[PDB]
Amino acid sequence: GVPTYLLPGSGQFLTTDDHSSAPALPCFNPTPEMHIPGQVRNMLEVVQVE
Amino acid sequence: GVPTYLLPGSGQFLTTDDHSSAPALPCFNPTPEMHIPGQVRNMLEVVQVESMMEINNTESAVGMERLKVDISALTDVDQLLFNIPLDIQLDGPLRNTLVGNISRYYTHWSGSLEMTFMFCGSFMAAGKLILCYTPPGGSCPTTRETAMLGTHIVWDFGLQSSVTLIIPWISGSHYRMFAKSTNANVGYVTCFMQTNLIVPSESSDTCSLIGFIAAKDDFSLRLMRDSPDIGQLDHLHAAEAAYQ
Amino acid sequence: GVPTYLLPGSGQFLTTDDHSSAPALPCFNPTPEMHIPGQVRNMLEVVQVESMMEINNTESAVGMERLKVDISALTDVDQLLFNIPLDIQLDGPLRNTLVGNISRYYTHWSGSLEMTFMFCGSFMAAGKLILCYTPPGGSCPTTRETAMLGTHIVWDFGLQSSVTLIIPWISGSHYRMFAKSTNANVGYVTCFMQTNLIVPSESSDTCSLIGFIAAKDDFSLRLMRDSPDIGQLDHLHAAEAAYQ
Amino acid sequence: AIQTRTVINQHGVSETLVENFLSRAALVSKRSFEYKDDKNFFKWTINTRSFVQLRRKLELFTYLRFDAEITILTTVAVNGLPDLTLQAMFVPTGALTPEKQDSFHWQSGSNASVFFKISDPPARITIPFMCINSAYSVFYDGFAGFEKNGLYGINPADTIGNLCVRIVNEHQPVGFTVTVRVYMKPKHIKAWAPRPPRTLPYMSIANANYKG
Amino acid sequence: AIQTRTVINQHGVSETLVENFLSRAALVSKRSFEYKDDKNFFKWTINTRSFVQLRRKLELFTYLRFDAEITILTTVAVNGLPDLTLQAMFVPTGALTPEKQDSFHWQSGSNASVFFKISDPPARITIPFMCINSAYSVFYDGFAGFEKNGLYGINPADTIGNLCVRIVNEHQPVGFTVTVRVYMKPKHIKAWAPRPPRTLPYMSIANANYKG
Amino acid sequence: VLQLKLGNSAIVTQEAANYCCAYGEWPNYLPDHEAVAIDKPTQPETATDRFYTLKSVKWETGSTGWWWKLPDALNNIGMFGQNVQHHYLYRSGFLIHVQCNATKFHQGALLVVAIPEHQRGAHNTNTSPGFDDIMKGEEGGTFNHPYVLDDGTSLACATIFPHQWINLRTNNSATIVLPWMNAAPMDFPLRHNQWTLAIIPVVPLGTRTTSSMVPITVSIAPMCCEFNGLRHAIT
């Protein structure tokens, strides 16, 4: 097959990783997005408010 | 999925690998790069810069008197002022230099060097030196007669107070057999009094020489090692303060 | 991430794999390639070079006398000087040759060979030989009459002192059954005195033959093994000096 | 002592690059701690001044800019052999550091904790450039405290942060010693203003003192 | 002893290539060391003269140029079964070699240390071509020391370097023996000036002596 | 075209008729892309590109062989021996002209073979050969065990090296033209010998009279010498 070797840092749980994991309930459609007023895209929008 | 088998050398931590790892704080913007003057892209740029030699090479010369060779009326007619053993690795004039200490981080090293002998007497002080490059394998000259037979340069210090001195290809490395195996010899740069020193009645009778050493662009270094110039033996103070 | 499962044969160290591994000193430039004369790209180039046979094949011949066959007035009219059993594997003339010792690193081997019999008597020394290639399966000739019936070459050594002798396709291998199983026979190259040796009164009565053996371009080797010509039994001296 | 020589046939300047000079995973920290449940864990303020081999090699430069690629190599020694889970929580400047093995700071969501086992390959995280100046002042001619008789040569900006390593496991019937070897390979290295190599031996890790 | 024969149907010269002839991961070193914390570690100057099978096979050539692909196969035997971490630090020419298990040379950042466990697959590193001549002189007709009555046939350039293997673990309650098998597969092989195959048995690993 | 006439030395023989470019390579100077080799190798002219004719060795019936290690055979001789004792580097191929003058009533065969890196072995001991056992000089050395070439490896396979046969029936001469045979681009003559001219009589000398004192004369021409500079301009 594909010759693969393990790097150091294999099998570690880094709490700041961004690896997509196996979804628990796949083929489950969530509730569709409703336009809720006042979305915060950025925490500086909280800070710029008096 | 993807059929993968483990190679030998899997799960090993090789200290000289170049595998990008999982960043601890991703989506953290670092401080932006500011144009700081004098970036070193290459350690040979450190080596090509001139640096003073310890050309006095006497045992009694402690510390700062090693950087200069005093010439006077005591040097009578033909005196060996200094020989410079061109072994960067071995203890001598070229040991504690920029070409000296950076080439002790590397095992194998080869290239041309470039000496500069700046005379530091008075303006009235006249005289001559004969700076003699002995190639490796040849014998070091003991007399000034033997010194002018080989490669030399008769330097009258009149208005000319500095000599660029190209040395061809000082090479060498470290060795180990089945240690105590150094470089044999890469030649010498000796200096004999051609004339006597001439100073007037107001200038000082004792004048000095500063020697420099730099590498040219053809100097090269490889097989990086650890430099034994430093070493901890007992302790460093407050070494446990990085843990407490 | 990437769904990967482990195959059988994962984490194994197969000694005949061709997987590139993590280099110990990466970003280390090795010494550049210098054109050294006589590169061997292929071990058959070692085999195609001629090499002396041990054509004397008597038990009393110790060492260097094995390389030559002495002919004299003792060889009366029709004497078997030498047979060359064409078994490279078995102990004989072709054992300790270049075609002999490189074909003991390989199990299966097949191809044409090429003998060269250089006569090393005086210039005045005349006579005849009859060099007889017996094919495999045939019987070795005992008399010179039987020798000229098969494939032969009647060689008068007048000005002609060397014979290129193409042997067609000496093959063979090793065997093992449910060992003691060698190649049967791949024929012979025998030599009988056709005439008597003629030397004058000043040349020596005893003249000699050097035989060579080389492979042609069609000789081939496969299933590489270990050659049993060498073997350590007790010790080598200072073998622990590579560790101490 | 014999004296040999050989023709040195080289080609290239690429091995003397500063990216190539300093990027070696050198051991930067090694202490053992007894475990039975510092109070039985491993914390260490990340500096390069702990070992004089990397220190003099980095004190060739004034300013450095590197991503430190910390590799926590953990070995264990029993005073049965257990399998253990560790936490090499990296504590930056500003986040609080643990004082005990079971403090509330180990479960901080904002600290970059990495959870790894001893039977795994060694844990490796790339700590980024976190000086708030644009380079690490290897030498800081100046004071942290504003006209205060405190400590000289400590840049307030050059703090990497404490690297705190504990054992996630609770009390176990065997007491054992855990030696945490931290290997740092600086990478993406820019370096400014080269300096003379230090000749005299060091006296402390806080400063550039010398005995002679 | 029966005498059989078979029609040998072959095709190709590719198996007799010198790249194909020598690139077999042959065992080049094997010694055991007791461990309790040489003084309980494994060091070995990398030569091919330790075993006569690879030695005669490489003494078919005068000059060789290969990347040695060292595979450290480590097995362990107890005099509970522990899991161990090892360090196969490769010490080139010029870097100092350890004398004890806990010397300061094991933590050298410039030496190419590889940290591996016994329960892992075997550690494999590709040591490059590090002769400073452009090929390894298998036979060196000449002397290292310049007109010195020392040792004949030792090229100063052909030193690979010591391969030093220790156990990173500290003291443990069980004493155990560790046998380190080093497998070297030379690769990227160029070879020059073929030589006669050696007939007489070897007398030493230092030289080409013979008894007859 | 060979023309055995190098410098002031020359060999006016008649029956030479062939030479052997060793490993198919003619000796040349150091190539210009190898500037690493210190920047000043002088290229000496026919001061050293000349035949250095050694002693004629007395080949009898009971002679085992002769070996001259190159350039150890020429480190005491003439302008090559002077330059060796001053220059620490050199890079020289060699032209060897061995000829064994004999009548038409002599017999024998010389394996005039040039062995690159002939690391000799001592017999029946584990001590390595000393400096005086290896470095002989103008006299050369005699093979102790020529069937194993004094290094345990066979004479029968020694034709893998560059060799010519002096079969005294056919030819009296052998000419082997050696290139620079080293891993290094230049090397060190007082402590290393790249080649070893080995003359092994495979078939011994034979005539019905008393043991014939047939001379074998060796002439070694160091073609395409280089050395250390020693005359560099320090600016």
TrEMBL record, chains D, E:
Subunit comment: Interacts with capsid protein VP1 and capsid protein VP3 in the mature capsid. Interacts with protein 3CD.
Function: Protein 3CD: Involved in the viral replication complex and viral polypeptide maturation. It exhibits protease activity with a specificity and catalytic efficiency that is different from protease 3C. Protein 3CD lacks polymerase activity. Protein 3CD binds to the 5'UTR of the viral genome. RNA-directed RNA polymerase: Replicates the viral genomic RNA on the surface of intracellular membranes. May form linear arrays of subunits that propagate along a strong head-to-tail interaction called interface-I. Covalently attaches UMP to a tyrosine of VPg, which is used to prime RNA synthesis. The positive stranded RNA genome is first replicated at virus induced membranous vesicles, creating a dsRNA genomic replication form. This dsRNA is then used as template to synthesize positive stranded RNA genomes. ss(+)RNA genomes are either translated, replicated or encapsidated.
Family statement drawn from the similarity comment of this UniProt entry: Belongs to the picornaviruses polyprotein family.
Compartments where found: Host cytoplasmic vesicle membrane; Host nucleus; Virion
Superkingdom, natural source: Viruses
Name by which UniProt lists this protein: Genome polyprotein
Residue numbers of the full-length protein present here: 606 to 833 of 2188
From TrEMBL, chain F:
Localization per record: Host cytoplasmic vesicle membrane; Host nucleus; Virion
Superkingdom in the source lineage: Viruses
SUBUNIT field: Interacts with protein 3CD. Homohexamer; forms a hexameric ring structure with 6-fold symmetry characteristic of AAA+ ATPases. Interacts (via N-terminus) with host RTN3 (via reticulon domain); this interaction is important for viral replication. Interacts with capsid protein VP3; this interaction may be important for virion morphogenesis.
Family, per entry: Belongs to the picornaviruses polyprotein family.
Reported function: Acts as a primer for viral RNA replication and remains covalently bound to viral genomic RNA. VPg is uridylylated prior to priming replication into VPg-pUpU. The oriI viral genomic sequence may act as a template for this. The VPg-pUpU is then used as primer on the genomic RNA poly(A) by the RNA-dependent RNA polymerase to replicate the viral genome. During genome replication, the VPg-RNA linkage is removed by the host TDP2, thereby accelerating replication.
Protein's UniProt name: Genome polyprotein
Origin species: Human enterovirus D68 (EV68)
Span of the entire protein shown here: 82 to 316 of 2188
